[PDB]
RNA sequence: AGGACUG
């Protein structure tokens, strides 16, 4: 009992496709977990060579959830790297295409604690680590911490739903990137 | 990390 979400929430980027992968075989594969609305494998215009990547659009985000839960994916004898897609409009933010397991979580003030985060974020995946940042040499809480999962996808899914309310607070949740966000 | 490079 949902409406269609906007496209960005239903779209998958598939990296590391084999050269013999086509739209029909990619579509065949991802149709196991949902109805495909669009499917495209990007080619060199001159050579018509596959660029080794593509995009599938599911009809609901739930189907993306299901397909991601089914990993790993072998399409044409090669394990592919599927990720929630990055909008054309955000493709050039620093660190846009970088896959990480570490979630940033700010906006939490001083009353928020590891158990609030665990309890809240448990429902997205297996957590490895939770660290609430206290001040170096004061122990004063700094308003933020880091959740690290065993997989990148809970992070991506979390950040895609950008609105999260935790311990009463509006939390800022982003990826925790080092200066790996340096690319031109 | 995008099809219309069909601007």
Curated annotation (Swiss-Prot):
Molecular function, one GO term: miRNA binding
UniProt keyword terms in alphabetical order: Acetylation, Cytoplasm, Disease variant, Host-virus interaction, Isopeptide bond, Methylation, mRNA processing, mRNA splicing, mRNA transport, Nucleus, Phosphoprotein, Repeat, Ribonucleoprotein, RNA-binding, Secreted, Spliceosome, Transport, Ubl conjugation
N6-acetyllysine, modified sites: 157, 162
Residues where Omega-N-methylarginine is found: 27
UniProt GO BP: DNA geometric change; miRNA transport; mRNA export from nucleus; mRNA processing; mRNA splicing, via spliceosome; mRNA transport; positive regulation of telomere maintenance via telomere lengthening; primary miRNA processing
Post-translational modification (record): Sumoylated in exosomes, promoting miRNAs-binding.
Glycyl lysine isopeptide (Lys-Gly) (interchain with G-Cter in SUMO2), cross-linked positions: 11, 93, 101, 109, 126, 141, 157, 162, 175
Residues carrying Phosphothreonine: 129, 148, 165
One Gene Ontology cellular component: ribonucleoprotein complex
Signal peptide span: none
RRM domain: residues covered: 10-93, 101-180
Residue numbers of N6,N6-dimethyllysine PTMs: 93
Residues found modified as Phosphoserine: 18, 74, 138, 178
Subunit organization: Homodimer; dimerization is required for nucleocytoplasmic translocation. Identified in the spliceosome C complex. Identified in a IGF2BP1-dependent mRNP granule complex containing untranslated mRNAs. Interacts with IGF2BP1. Interacts with C9orf72. Interacts with DGCR8. Interacts with TARDBP. Interacts with CKAP5. Interacts with TBK1. Interacts with STING1. Interacts with SRC. Interacts with PPIA/CYPA. Interacts (via C-terminus) with FAM76B; the interaction results in retention of HNRNPA2B1 in the nucleus and inhibition of the NF-kappa-B-mediated inflammatory pathway.
Pathological association: Inclusion body myopathy with early-onset Paget disease with or without frontotemporal dementia 2: An autosomal dominant disease characterized by disabling muscle weakness clinically resembling to limb girdle muscular dystrophy, osteolytic bone lesions consistent with Paget disease, and premature frontotemporal dementia. Clinical features show incomplete penetrance. Oculopharyngeal muscular dystrophy 2: An autosomal dominant, early-onset myopathy characterized by progressive muscle weakness, ptosis, ophthalmoplegia, dysphagia, and variable degrees of respiratory insufficiency.
Function: Heterogeneous nuclear ribonucleoprotein (hnRNP) that associates with nascent pre-mRNAs, packaging them into hnRNP particles. The hnRNP particle arrangement on nascent hnRNA is non-random and sequence-dependent and serves to condense and stabilize the transcripts and minimize tangling and knotting. Packaging plays a role in various processes such as transcription, pre-mRNA processing, RNA nuclear export, subcellular location, mRNA translation and stability of mature mRNAs. Forms hnRNP particles with at least 20 other different hnRNP and heterogeneous nuclear RNA in the nucleus.
UniProt name for this protein: Heterogeneous nuclear ribonucleoproteins A2/B1
